[PDB]
Design a protein around this nucleic acid. Sequence first.
RNA 1: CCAAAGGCUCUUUUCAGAGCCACCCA
Lengths: 276, 67
Amino acid sequence: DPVYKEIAITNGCINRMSKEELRAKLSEFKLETRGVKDVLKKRLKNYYKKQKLMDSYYDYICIIDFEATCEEGNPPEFVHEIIEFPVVLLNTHTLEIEDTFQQYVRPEINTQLSDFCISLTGITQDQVDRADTFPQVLKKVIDWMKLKELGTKYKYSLLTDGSWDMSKFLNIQCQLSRLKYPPFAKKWINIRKSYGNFYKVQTKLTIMLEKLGMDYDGRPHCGLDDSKNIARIAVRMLQDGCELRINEKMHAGQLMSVSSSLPIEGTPPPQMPHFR
Amino acid sequence: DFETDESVLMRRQKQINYGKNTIAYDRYIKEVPGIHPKTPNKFKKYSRRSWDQQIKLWKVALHFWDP
RNA sequence: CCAAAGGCUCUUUUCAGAGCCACCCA
């Protein structure tokens, strides 16, 4: 289409603008003016593309950020057990956090939280001592998603800041609890991978917010708060015109990338996995 | 030692053709150095990141005969 | 010399678009 020709040209034109020039046009068009040079270049390019060009998309996105038992020094051969299971429901149309779920989990092996863990996450020994076991919390999480009608009435996907919440934490937690890894959790959106490709900028939640001109809100390493801050990042990216896509999956208990070359992946409705 | 791989050479040549098949490139050869855009040498050994960058800077440069 | 360059891969949106790996996740 000839209109793309016109876009590629403006793109190059925007590629040569300085930060102030960029900051100027965006202001002029009354758009978000915060963020590093790359964020702005991208923000401005999509404005045009969008303008010069005038769903199959997810209705909701579940942001999940686990906290787990840990130890000082962060050793590689550590057996982590999930202690906080949060979920933040993001309405892609409304672009707002519709609802949230939070529960602490009592670990079966590392029953006693180290001091490092307690100070890092802010989760106390009493909170965990009186919490439920992973399978029980997983049941409650699944019942909560079912009440939201995810997978049935609504098209949705899981989203995480990285690939370890799914590929590592939930993965070994399932092994420890002796249950089969949940099929609804085999594919997901790794917001970091997206963020890097979209804006062209390591990746810490704290760094992604910064390069966006955003301030963190809540207690760091509180599962729910990070999740809520990750949702602020997803909202902003959707608003900057990024089409977040399931980009990673679990196959044979091994992390694999999902091709951006395939139709929008719809996640199955949640179902409590079986033991064994 | 240089680049011998036919598939690499062919891919690079196509990239160069994309640049040469522009009119700014023909405007260039009509008129015309040190700043004058020089075509990347495909037989040279370069990393993928370096080759692509040279091609990107070269193509941008040729439009000095355009916007 | 210079210039280019993290290692790679796809596309005429090629003044341009897209992706994988590495790095990062408590």
